[PDB]
Amino acid sequence: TAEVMSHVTAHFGKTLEECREESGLSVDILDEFKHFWSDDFDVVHRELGCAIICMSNKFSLMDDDVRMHHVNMDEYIKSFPNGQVLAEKMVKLIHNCEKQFDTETDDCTRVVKVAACFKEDSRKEGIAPEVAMVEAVIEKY
Numbered sequence: 158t159a160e161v162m163s164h165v166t167a168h169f170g171k172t173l174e175e176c177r178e179e180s181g182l183s184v185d186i187l188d189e190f191k192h193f194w195s196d197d198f199d200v201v202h203r204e205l206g207c208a209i210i211c212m213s214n215k216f217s218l219m220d221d222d223v224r225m226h227h228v229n230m231d232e233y234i235k236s237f238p239n240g241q242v243l244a245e246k247m248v249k250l251i252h253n254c255e256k257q258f259d260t261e262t263d264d265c266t267r268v269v270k271v272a273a274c275f276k277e278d279s280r281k282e283g284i285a286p287e288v289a290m291v292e293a294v295i296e297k298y
């Protein structure tokens with residue numbers, strides 16, 4: 158659900174600032190991670206793929222093939238209030254998007270394509286949160 162997705166986003170997003178230098182993700186590309194969910198943000202830059210890699214690796218959320226670690230992602234989602242209702246669905250969506258971009262050889266570009274797929278399928282499945290919702294949860298943990 159959208160509230161669980163806003164807790165995952167708010168928490169995950171905390172690692173954005175420490176990942177900027179190494180990914181090249183200028184503040185003019187993405188200022189706050191929460192804006193990932195805006196209608197006016199295009200999830201397209203290779204730099205943001207590189208940043209998502211950096212962020213993920215902080216929480217062990219990707220495996221050594223630079224794809225989602227399913228078990229660690231399940232446990233991470235379940236660590237939020239009401240996480241059990243999202244954990245299976247979100248792992249399924251990400252992994253279906255992963256399958257669509259398996260032929261992309263550049264890991265950064267691949268990850269940003271997967272992320273744009275995941276945003277669109279989240280919107281489609283009615284689990285994409287509003288930016289206001291992520292902001293409402295930003296001070297937690």
Ligand SMILES: CCCCC/C=C\C=C\CCCCCCCO
Nearest residue numbers: 165166169224225268271272275
């Ligand atoms: C992965 C943490 C989830 C945070 C939710 C909001 C936005 C981020 C979506 C990241 C897309 C999934 C990246 C890993 C799949 C690429 O192989």
Ligand SMILES: [Mg+2]
Nearest residue numbers: 178179180181
């Ligand atoms: Mg770099």
Ligand SMILES: [Mg+2]
Nearest residue numbers: 195196197287
């Ligand atoms: Mg709107």
Ligand SMILES: [Mg+2]
Nearest residue numbers: 214217219220
């Ligand atoms: Mg690792």
